[PDB]
Design an enzyme around this catalytic site. Structure first.
Site, PDB file in Angstrom:
ATOM      1  N   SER A   1       0.845  -1.216   0.000  1.00 16.69           N
ATOM      2  CA  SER A   1       0.000   0.000   0.000  1.00 16.69           C
ATOM      3  C   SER A   1       0.856   1.232   0.000  1.00 16.69           C
ATOM      4  CB  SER A   1      -0.812   0.002   1.259  1.00 16.69           C
ATOM      5  OG  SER A   1      -1.571  -1.176   1.331  1.00 16.69           O
TER       6      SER A   1
ATOM      7  N   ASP B   1       5.583 -12.087  18.341  1.00 10.40           N
ATOM      8  CA  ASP B   1       6.786 -12.819  18.739  1.00 10.40           C
ATOM      9  C   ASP B   1       6.430 -14.284  18.917  1.00 10.40           C
ATOM     10  OD1 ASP B   1       8.156 -10.382  18.825  1.00 10.40           O
ATOM     11  OD2 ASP B   1       8.514 -10.445  20.966  1.00 10.40           O
TER      12      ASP B   1
END
Ligand code: CA
Ligand code: CA
Lengths: 524, 195
Positions: free
Chosen positions: A1, A76
């Protein structure tokens, strides 16, 4: 984008400008939904992703907004140490802990079958992968876990905002990783890299999974004041194509998108080549970015420099240099004949493919199932650039002599294939255009409709575009939201007249007016 | 122009709906209604994507996808807890939006041959009613895609595969060139002095 915001001093009219270009693929019905919302003190026109109760690309009475994906580090993976005697137990803060277990039933259309699967969670999140041979399970922590509804609320508040302070408050509450862009009728622009970014252990390398035993946990989330952000930056504009927010902002395992060679260069080049700009200029920049062969920015000069050293003895190299120098770096079809206009672009594409292969096959070939997506990434090829240009690298991939031999061998092979299959004149090399359709399956990877078979040229472009000028009276400008507004197909096969009536606009770089004033809406 | 309940809906020449309401509760219900008028099958399938129920419609090709979605997703009760943590008015507007979708569903099942799109007829199933939790599911199915990745695991595999062939010191150098800590020359959207 991609996105651009232009402040008052960089805009020809002295009004702030905004450009949107979210890249969510091309499907029918479309990924976007355009709407106008009007209640007391709230007037807003634009589009949002399908199903969202808010506008993401558009403008209210006071401000225009857009967004691009942030690529910031909000996921994570934790490496859980499993009990050798019980694989549903993991070691955490000094004690074996039990995984939470969940049975799930899936009904599958054949009659229908029922199949059961068991899923597990740890304190860190869902278990995504096992390395049973290592007595490890991998769990996944999202910084935004359980705060997705607060992110919806933040976006709604951005819709209701009237000024920088209120928009910034909304930005500070959004928990997922996006870039937000703002322009207002007072001439202000603002940029925010939004999201909740965790405070990580300084003892771990954040490019790799974190041990899950308890010594390396997140310690809360940083203040929003530490997220990259700027109001009215001195340069007078902001451009973005998913690139790095600021020099010292890091994103861990996903740094591969933020290198010296980065596609946002197309927008930087366009803005820096101009003085004050208007919406027509912004459209020209979008066109360039949409058709650019992105490797040209750094790699075409390197190729020319090498060929020029040997053009005295090789007439073919002199011809290539002339053709490369006159090429505008685009793969475009201005005469709509179904072939890209520059024949040398076909040479350049094959040269690049050969060069990338020769640079890395002898070292990374064995891991290329994981590394080709890095070294030939759609946003840039930074490592390849550094090797070919002789800039410092940690590993000595190739000497300058070896790099030049690669450039030359890749040239010879590409030219030999074109000579064999097409001829010696570059006009004979012009490649047929690649086309795309607005199909049935989006990035969510499941079918949502029947698609469309109408072919248009492939463009490296937003799935919609808005061009907005924040005039004193109201937001003004133009936009396109292909394929069309309405996804309904009647039982008998009759298509809505608004199923694909914006495809021609999209394909032909035409737009419909941005509507805001009710008197305009009524005649539109 | 047409008045649906007490909201005026003006559809322009491209079919875009422009909604004129006296308050936000009415506005957000109309917003869900027009979106369902235009896109009901798409909304249904996006929700099934998040719920992991696509294979009920499209078969075993989507089972592993449904399993991933359920593995990483949330129960209805967990989503309801999220909604209950919002500002009162905001939760209520999301509820209105879901009520608008449901209003179109209810209208469509009364006249299915005219108001249920061809995909429902061809695949032989019907749309269900919507709740606010389902609206959150529509947000999650698409927005989470841009946030979620397992590159840490790929990186660990790259390093391990390089180490076992090239040794640790060489593998570390190669990895640092593949996935850098910070490329100080990468183009940036702002300067540090702009912060
Ligand atoms: Ca991470
Ligand atoms: Ca042409």
């Amino acid at each position: 984008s991609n996105a651009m915001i232009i402040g008052a001093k960089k805009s020809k009219s002295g009004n702030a400008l905004l450009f949107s270009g979210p890249q969510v693929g091309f499907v029918a019905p479309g990924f976007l939904y355009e709407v106008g919302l009007h209640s007391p003190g709230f007037d807003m026109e634009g589009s949002g992703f399908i199903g969202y109760p808010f506008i993401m690309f558009g403008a209210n009475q006071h401000l225009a907004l857009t967004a691009t994906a942030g690529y910031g580090n909000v996921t994570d993976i934790f490496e859980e140490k499993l009990n050798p005697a019980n694989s549903t137990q993991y070691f955490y803060k000094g004690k074996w802990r039990n995984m939470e277990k969940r049975t799930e039933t899936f009904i599958v259309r054949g009659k229908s079958k029922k199949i059961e699967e068991t899923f597990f969670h740890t304190v860190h999140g869902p278990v995504i992968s096992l390395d049973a041979a290592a007595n490890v399970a991998y769990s996944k922590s999202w910084s935004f876990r359980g705060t997705e509804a607060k992110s919806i609320q933040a976006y709604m508040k951005a819709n209701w905002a009237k000024n920088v302070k209120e928009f910034q408050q909304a930005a500070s509450e959004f928990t997922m990783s996006l870039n937000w862009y703002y322009a207002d009728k007072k001439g202000n622009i603002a940029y925010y890299h939004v999201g909740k970014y965790p405070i990580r252990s300084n003892q771990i390398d954040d490019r790799f999974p974190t041990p899950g035993t308890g010594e390396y946990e997140w310690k809360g989330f940083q203040s929003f004041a530490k997220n990259p952000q700027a109001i009215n930056p001195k340069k007078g504009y902001v451009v973005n194509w998913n690139n790095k927010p600021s020099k010292y902002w890091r994103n861990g395992e996903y740094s591969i998108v933020w290198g010296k060679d980065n596609r946002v260069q197309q927008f930087i080049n366009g803005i820096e080549a101009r003085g004050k700009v208007d919406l027509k200029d912004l459209n020209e920049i979008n066109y360039t970015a949409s058709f650019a062969q992105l490797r040209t920015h750094y790699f075409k000069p390197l190729l020319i420099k090498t060929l020029e050293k040997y053009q005295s003895e090789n007439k073919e190299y002199a011809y290539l240099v002339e053709q490369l120098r006159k090429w505008n770096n685009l793969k475009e079809d201005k005469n709509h004949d179904g072939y890209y206009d520059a024949g040398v672009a076909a040479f350049f594409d094959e040269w690049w493919n050969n060069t990338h292969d020769k640079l890395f096959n002898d070292s990374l070939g064995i891991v290329s199932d994981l590394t080709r997506e890095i070294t030939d990434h759609r946003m840039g090829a930074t490592l390849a650039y550094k090797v070919l240009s002789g800039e410092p690298t940690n590993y000595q991939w190739k000497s300058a002599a070896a790099a030049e031999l690669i450039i030359l061998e890749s040239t010879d092979e590409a030219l030999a294939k074109l000579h064999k299959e097409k001829g010696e004149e570059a006009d004979k090399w012009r490649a047929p255009i690649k086309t795309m359709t607005f199909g049935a399956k989006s990035l969510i990877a499941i079918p949502h409709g029947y698609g469309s078979k109408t072919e248009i040229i492939e463009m490296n472009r937003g799935s919609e575009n808005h061009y907005i000028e924040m005039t004193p009276k109201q937001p003004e400008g133009f936009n396109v939201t292909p394929p069309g507004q309405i996804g309904f197909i009647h039982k008998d096969g009759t298509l809505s007249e608004h199923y694909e009536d914006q495809l021609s606009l999209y394909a032909n770089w035409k737009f419909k007016p941005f509507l805001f004033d009710k008197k305009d809406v009524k005649r539109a | 122009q047409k008045k649906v309940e007490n909201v005026t809906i003006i559809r322009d020449s491209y079919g875009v709906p422009h909604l004129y309401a006296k308050n936000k509760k009415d506005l957000y219900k109309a917003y869900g209604y027009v979106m369902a008028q235009d896109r009901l099958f798409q909304l249904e399938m996006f929700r099934r994507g998040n719920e992991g129920t696509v294979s009920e419609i499209f078969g075993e090709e989507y089972v592993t996808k449904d399993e991933q979605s359920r593995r990483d997703g949330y129960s209805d009760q967990e989503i309801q807890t999220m909604l209950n943590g919002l500002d009162r008015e905001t939760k209520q507007l999301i509820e209105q939006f879901a009520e608008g979708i449901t209003a179109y569903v209810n209208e469509a099942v009364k006249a299915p041959d005219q108001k249920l799109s061809k995909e429902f007829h061809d695949y032989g199933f019907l749309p269900r009613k919507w709740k606010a939790t389902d609206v959150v599911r529509l947000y999650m199915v698409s927005m989470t895609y841009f946030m979620d990745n397992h590159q840490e695991l790929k990186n660990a595999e790259i390093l391990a595969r390089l180490e076992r062939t090239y040794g640790k010191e060489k593998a570390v150098k190669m990895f640092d060139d593949l996935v850098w800590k910070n490329d100080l020359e990468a183009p940036t959207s702002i300067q540090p002095d702009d912060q």
